[model samples]
Target: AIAKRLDACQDQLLELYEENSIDIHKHIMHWKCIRLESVLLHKAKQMGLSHIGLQVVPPLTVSETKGHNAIEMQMHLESLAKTQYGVEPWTLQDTSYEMWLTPPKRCFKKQGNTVEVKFVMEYVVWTHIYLQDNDSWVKVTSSVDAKGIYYTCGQFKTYYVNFNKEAQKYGSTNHWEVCYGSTVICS
Candidate 1:
């Protein structure tokens, strides 16, 4: 079920890029990523997961004109997971959630005039489960399971181009711009 949904979402996102290849705005792509997160969250809920703490970092924009640096981008994501989701990287069971899932997949791709940034995470639901440990019942849960839930979020934006009449007239040196962006505990 999740496999099909994931494929559909990916297809739609690619279609959005294909349809507005030339005149796409960064904001539009940003919202599309946000929408993907929501779609996955709702699907997870439908599949019996009680809660999903979505963590979305501030959108990072890079260009010759203005934006945050690569280190700053790393800092933004680090703080986002720690302060907001209680997630620490590169450790076993780092999240504070009942079922801790960490190491969200961060991916980036640059092709032609467009750049695609994506984030994906997987989780499992083990609510109301009890393990027969010794004599007493233990409330045990595990995040590693084949029936895990998955979510994705990210943005696809074009590299910066100074096509404005004023910039062209003034001969601006701005050459590139791209947005690295967010949400359902991904990106």
Candidate 2:
């Protein structure tokens, strides 16, 4: 299977340039680069492939803004959690608003009986506040798992500004981000 996948990707491979140097404990070591197409394309046909592979991509779909109104969105997410899951939401643990060109990896410890590994995993949840053409502000949440590679696990609609329908108005053009440590709260 690995060989078959390599064969499929062979046309996009390149060897290291002679100008680039590497020191090896052995006599020689060689390197090559592979220009892979977005995994989103492959995962459409091979849904199971992302589970075992390490893949990452830049944040290319959304532009960044300075003001995301995170405090208000945090309150809204809390309300959303309570209404949807029928439970009291916990305190807002942490918030991130920076827009990254590259998908960021998170760190978690993997421990066995005698060994521990700090696994660098995929992007944390990005809770986006986007404005639709219909004049509704929508909240979309996306995330990936450590063991499941960098493919998006699922993107779900959590809330909308139109829910209240009154003189209600919130959110900015800037997309907000929140990391919910409690699974019971956000999931």
Candidate 3:
């Protein structure tokens, strides 16, 4: 039954890729399989199943040079953990030392061409902050080479800005007055 469910899920995923115009055969990797297995394992655990075994697959690695930026290397390591373990290990454990030893070529390159040069940009960083109070300005200290914008906070920091009627009020009728209020206190 488990195998049947897995097969059905795979078929569904394939259909979804087809509907979305995604080349699953060409773009899918072992890490994606690991993530799928991870979800399955979690489900199995919830079902009171024991002794379930899954074949562990490792991610592909490549050699790197000495000239790579430290941030880029770190991002590659983070991606490797996400792809291989189905979790971002660095977020929970120390990976700073491990990232240094891995070769630089494993890093993802950004999509663009450098003008007046042939250099390529790779890897992007996403940083988020929650405004704690209304009319409060949080000075962003982090710098980025790319564009940055504010995102309204939600579950998993899901950023969504609502521009409905009530959203336009609350701050003396000023649109910018919409900000995070004090956490709700329950007695």
Give the alpha-carbon lDDT of every model. Answer: 0.30, 0.26, 0.30
Per-residue lDDT tens digits for candidate 3, residues 57-155, read 222121112113333433443344333222311221122224232222122212112111001112222232212233232212111221211233332
Best by TM-score: 3
Whole-model lDDT, model 1: 0.30
Lowest lDDT 10-residue stretch of candidate 2:
108-117
Q: Report the backbone clash tally of model 1.
A: 1
- Please list all clashing residue pairs in model 1, or write none if there are none: 160-177
Clashing pairs in 3: 64-104, 109-122, 110-121, 110-122
Model 3 regions lying over 4 Å from their true place: 1-3, 7-29, 52-101, 105-187
In angstroms, how far off is 113's CA in candidate 3? 26
Candidate 1's C-alpha runs over 4 A off are 17-20, 25-30, 45-187
Predicted candidate 2 versus true structure: per-residue lDDT over 7-107, tens digit per residue: 45433322322323222101011111121222332432354342324433223221111112333333333333333221322211211222212222211
